[PDB]
Amino acid sequence: LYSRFPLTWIMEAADDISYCVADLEDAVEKRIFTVEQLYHHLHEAWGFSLVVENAWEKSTEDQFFMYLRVNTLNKLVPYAAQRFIDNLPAIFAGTFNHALLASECSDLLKLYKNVAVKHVFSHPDVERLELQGYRVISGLLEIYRPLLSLSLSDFTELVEKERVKRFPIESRLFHKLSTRHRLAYVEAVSKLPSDSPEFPLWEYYYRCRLLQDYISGMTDLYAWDEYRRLMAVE
Amino acid sequence: QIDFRKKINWHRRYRSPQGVKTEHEILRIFESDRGRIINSPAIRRLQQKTQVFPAVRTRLTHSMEVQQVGRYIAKEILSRLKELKLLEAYGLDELTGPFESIVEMSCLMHDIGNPPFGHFGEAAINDWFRQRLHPEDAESQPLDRCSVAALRLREEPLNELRRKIRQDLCHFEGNAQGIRLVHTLMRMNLTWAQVGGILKYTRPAWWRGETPETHHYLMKKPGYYLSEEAYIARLRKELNLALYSRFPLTWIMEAADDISYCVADLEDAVEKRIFTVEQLYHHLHEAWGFSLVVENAWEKSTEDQFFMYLRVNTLNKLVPYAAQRFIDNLPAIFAGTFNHALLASECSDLLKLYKNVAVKHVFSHPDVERLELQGYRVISGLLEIYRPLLSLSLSDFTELVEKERVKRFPIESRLFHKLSTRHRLAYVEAVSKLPSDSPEFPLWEYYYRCRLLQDYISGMTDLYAWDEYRRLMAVE
Amino acid sequence: GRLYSGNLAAFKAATNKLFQLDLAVIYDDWYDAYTRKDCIRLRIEDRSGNLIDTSTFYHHDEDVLFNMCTDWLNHMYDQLKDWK
Amino acid sequence: GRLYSGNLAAFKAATNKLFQLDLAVIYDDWYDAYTRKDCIRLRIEDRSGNLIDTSTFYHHDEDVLFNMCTDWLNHMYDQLKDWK
Ligand SMILES: Nc1nc2c(ncn2[C@@H]2O[C@H](COP(=O)(O)OP(=O)(O)OP(=O)(O)O)[C@@H](O)[C@H]2O)c(=O)[nH]1
Numbered sequence: 062l063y064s065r066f067p068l069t070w071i072m073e074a075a076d077d078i079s080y081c082v083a084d085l086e087d088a089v090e091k092r093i094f095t096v097e098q099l100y101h102h103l104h105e106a107w108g109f110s111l112v113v114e115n116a117w118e119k120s121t122e123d124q125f126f127m128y129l130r131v132n133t134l135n136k137l138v139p140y141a142a143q144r145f146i147d148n149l150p151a152i153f154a155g156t157f158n159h160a161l162l163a164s165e166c167s168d169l170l171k172l173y174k175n176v177a178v179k180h181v182f183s184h185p186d187v188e189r190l191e192l193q194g195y196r197v198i199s200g201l202l203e204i205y206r207p208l209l210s211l212s213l214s215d216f217t218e219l220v221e222k223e224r225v226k227r228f229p230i231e232s233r234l235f236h237k238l239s240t241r242h243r244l245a246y247v248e249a250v251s252k253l254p255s256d257s258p259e260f261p262l263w264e265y266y267y268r269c270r271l272l273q274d275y276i277s278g279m280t281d282l283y284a285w286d287e288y289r290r291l292m293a294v295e
Numbered sequence: 296q297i298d299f300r301k302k303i304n305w306h307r308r309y310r311s312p313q314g315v316k317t318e319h320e321i322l323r324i325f326e327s328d329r330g331r332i333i334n335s336p337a338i339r340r341l342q343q344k345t346q347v348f349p350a351v352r353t354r355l356t357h358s359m360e361v362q363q364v365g366r367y368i369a370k371e372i373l374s375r376l377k378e379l380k381l382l383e384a385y386g387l388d389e390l391t392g393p394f395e396s397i398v399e400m401s402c403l404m405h406d407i408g409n410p411p412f413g414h415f416g417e418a419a420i421n422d423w424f425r426q427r428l429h430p431e432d433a434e435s436q437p438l439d440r441c442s443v444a445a446l447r448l449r450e451e452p453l454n455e456l457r458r459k460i461r462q463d464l465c466h467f468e469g470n471a472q473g474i475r476l477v478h479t480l481m482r483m484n485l486t487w488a489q490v491g492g493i494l495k496y497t498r499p500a501w502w503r504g505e506t507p508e509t510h511h512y513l514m515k516k517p518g519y520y521l522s523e524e525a526y527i528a529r530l531r532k533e534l535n536l537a538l539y540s541r542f543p544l545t546w547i548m549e550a551a552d553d554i555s556y557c558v559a560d561l562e563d564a565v566e567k568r569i570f571t572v573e574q575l576y577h578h579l580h581e582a583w584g585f586s587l588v589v590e591n592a593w594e595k596s597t598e599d600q601f602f603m604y605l606r607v608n609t610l611n612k613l614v615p616y617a618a619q620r621f622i623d624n625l626p627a628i629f630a631g632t633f634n635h636a637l638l639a640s641e642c643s644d645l646l647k648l649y650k651n652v653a654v655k656h657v658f659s660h661p662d663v664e665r666l667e668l669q670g671y672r673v674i675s676g677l678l679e680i681y682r683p684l685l686s687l688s689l690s691d692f693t694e695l696v697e698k699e700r701v702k703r704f705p706i707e708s709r710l711f712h713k714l715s716t717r718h719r720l721a722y723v724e725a726v727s728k729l730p731s732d733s734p735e736f737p738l739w740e741y742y743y744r745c746r747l748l749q750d751y752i753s754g755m756t757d758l759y760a761w762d763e764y765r766r767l768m769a770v771e
Numbered sequence: 772g773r774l775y776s777g778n779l780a781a782f783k784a785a786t787n788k789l790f791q792l793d794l795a796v797i798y799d800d801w802y803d804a805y806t807r808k809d810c811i812r813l814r815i816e817d818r819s820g821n822l823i824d825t826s827t828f829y830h831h832d833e834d835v836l837f838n839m840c841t842d843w844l845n846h847m848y849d850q851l852k853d854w855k
Numbered sequence: 856g857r858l859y860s861g862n863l864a865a866f867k868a869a870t871n872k873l874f875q876l877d878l879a880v881i882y883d884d885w886y887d888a889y890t891r892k893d894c895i896r897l898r899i900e901d902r903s904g905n906l907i908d909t910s911t912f913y914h915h916d917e918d919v920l921f922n923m924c925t926d927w928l929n930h931m932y933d934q935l936k937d938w939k
Pocket residue numbers: 076079080081084178182187856857
């Protein structure tokens with residue numbers, strides 16, 4: 062109970078290595094700053110010679126990161142392998158309460174971490190998209206709110222008949238959901254004991270899950286278009 | 296005794312020039328002010344604000360015509376006094392230069408404090424706050440619909456400040472915003488005489504009650520806010536003005552705006568094919584009931600030749616009357632207690648001719664009326680978006696302004712970075728002076744936060760506010 | 772030139788304040804013949820229709836005229852709440 | 856890497872739950888010199904300003920640090936509602 066698979070640790074360390082280095086390169090391609098400016102910022106934030114300086118003198122934009130990535134990999138991968146090998150019984154048991162990555166290796170990642178949050182994540186264009194996305198998801202949940210206000214019998218009739226003369230607005234919203242989510246809902250509710258005092262609770266839980274699956278399975282671009290169309294704007 | 300040397304003040308508030316100055320270096324002081332005002336961001340923004348129609352005149356082009364009319368009234372006044380040999384007796388022997396420059400710069404920056412969309416943009420700010428502060432419930436002893444715990448009446452010494460703050464925040468006026476913009480936000484550091492030329496009215500924004508009958512005209516609209524009370528007292532002490540008094544040169548600027556009120560809009564209507572020149576002439580003939588002013592221009596042309604002479608004809612009849620009215624009532628204007636305007640004769644009746652035609656055939660157009668309703672909706676929506684900023688506590692807002700990287704308020708922090716840096720600096724300077732260990736800190740902090748919110752909205756062009764409103768609602 | 776928003780808000784506030792005493796106000800406005808100034812007439816009466824008093828104000832400026840109307844309404848409210 | 860929404864919601868819920876007993880919480884956060892872990896200090900005091908107790912928590916992960924703060928706040932609420 063509450064244990065981890067041994068191979069999950071390797072996947073966790075891989076994500077931590079590729080956390081901010083790509084965003085720094087993407088910032089240069091958008092003319093936020095130049096390669097020399099980024100190098101100066103890294104030099105100021107560091108306080109590097111084996112990793113960053115080697116790449117700087119080996120280039121100029123597609124030749125600085127191409128060697129920085131190699132230089133940091135050649136210093137980070139063996140440390141992760143040694144950490145995995147040393148604490149092997151605990152990882153195999155699944156009770157290791159730490160991560161593979163407090164030394165010169167872990168301090169290096171914070172260098173890329175601090176530069177990215179101050180010069181890239183704080184850009185006005187990045188910040189604006191975060192506020193617009195919060196408004197889009199909230200609006201979509203309000204549009205489908207009538208589906209959650211129906212009763213068990215009404216929703217059963219909606220899912221069974223599919224041509225209801227009593228709920229014109231609710232039935233049309235129902236046909237917009239993907240067929241796979243509806244099939245999953247049907248399979249889930251097709252198993253609970255009908256003659257039990259727990260049927261309404263499970264039915265409501267599965268209905269909420271069905272609503273949550275539809276929203277989270279969208280691309281950013283599709284959700285914005287659907288939100289604008291359902292509000293009679295586009 | 297009239298002495299204009301005690302009124303024309305060339306001192307400043309910061310790094311003021313001290314010592315005795317000659318007539319040449321005094322003039323140099325009033326030219327740097329002109330350079331500062333003309334090359335200011337506040338004046339540049341005037342070309343993106345609409346007068347009536349969104350070759351049409353903007354506020355920048357409108358204020359340039361008012362500046363020319365002001366020059367001409369000052370020159371007529373100065374020349375008429377020399378005929379009576381009163382220039383030396385009145386102290387204007389060595390001040391004819393700055394006398395016209397002050398009027399010209401006051402006429403130029405007479406609309407720098409107007410909010411986007413103008414009048415209906417001013418109302419929208421007032422109603423939205425009126426629903427949150429309910430000023431009418433603080434007139435008398437404690438009753439309370441106020442939505443703020445700190446501003447609710449509960450404590451005699453603290454209730455007066457509460458009602459003053461509640462009344463002031465629901466009275467936003469463009470003229471009162473002009474003084475604040477010129478001193479606290481832009482930090483232009485103009486001379487005392489230049490600042491006094493843009494003080495049109497003397498009624499405080501927190502005033503509740505009946506005004507004295509001796510000043511019922513000079514106190515018809517709010518003149519300044521509570522945050523500028525200390526600055527206005529210093530200005531009055533510097534210019535030797537009594538309480539609720541006006542600067543002598545403000546009257547000339549007021550008359551210039553009244554002359555250029557509707558004549559430009561009538562010309563702009565023709566350029567938009569609302570009607571033709573002949574139709575406008577027929578309408579003017581029907582409304583009048585003209586021969587010396589309008590008929591002379593009509594027979595001297597056809598579109599760019601009818602108004603070009605009508606303006607000259609009306610100026611040659613209106614400017615001398617204004618100069619004579621200024622000269623006749625000189626002691627009262629100098630004292631600052633003249634309760635009337637320069638402009639009940641054939642001269643004042645003529646302006647109503649242009650007034651009545653414009654309101655019936657131009658201001659009632661469907662396209663003009665639609666923009667007024669859309670502007671009211673845009674300003675109301677922007678204030679609702681920033682409402683979470685006003686719902687925070689003192690500690691949370693202090694942490695937001697101090698740390699700038701808060702992990703507890705993701706939505707509130709991102710809205711905070713959208714405000715301009717000058718407004719944030721002004722807020723920091725304002726709150727960096729109040730006694731921290733006082734029972735009045737929360738009230739002043741809330742007042743300054745509301746002022747900071749109001750400065751950001753009113754400092755936008757019409758076009759920028761619409762775009763921001765559409766983008767923040769996930770529409771564009 | 773146009774009426775200021777605050778004056779209209781104060782006029783409406785006074786009207787509602789006097790309406791809280793189960794009263795009513797009628798409003799009339801016009802332009803005079805030769806005085807060259809707008810005129811506004813107010814009448815105060817209760818719900819049953821019994822006229823209490825009336826007043827007429829003349830002025831060529833909207834702001835001053837509305838302020839005079841508002842302060843007269845406030846005086847009426849004050850006098851009518853001094854007794855009854 | 857970033858703090859999860861549920862942990863912040865639970866922290867705010869605990870803060871409000873303890874605020875329902877006319878109390879208050881001050882929050883301080885910083886980064887230590889050499890321990891290489893963020894530090895958060897909480898102080899609990901009533902409305903009159905009489906400090907009751909304080910605590911400081913150090914951790915290099917945001918999620919664990921916030922959970923520790925939330926459970927310490929819950930323990931404080933429990934102890935303060937056991938008596939008084
Ligand atoms: N806009 C923005 N993106 C960020 C920020 N921090 C990280 N990112 C991006 O998101 C990626 C990682 O996502 P995080 O939210 O930090 O966390 P995570 O790795 O998804 O989290 P877990 O599933 O808990 O491991 C980084 O590689 C960046 O590309 C930030 O502050 N702002």
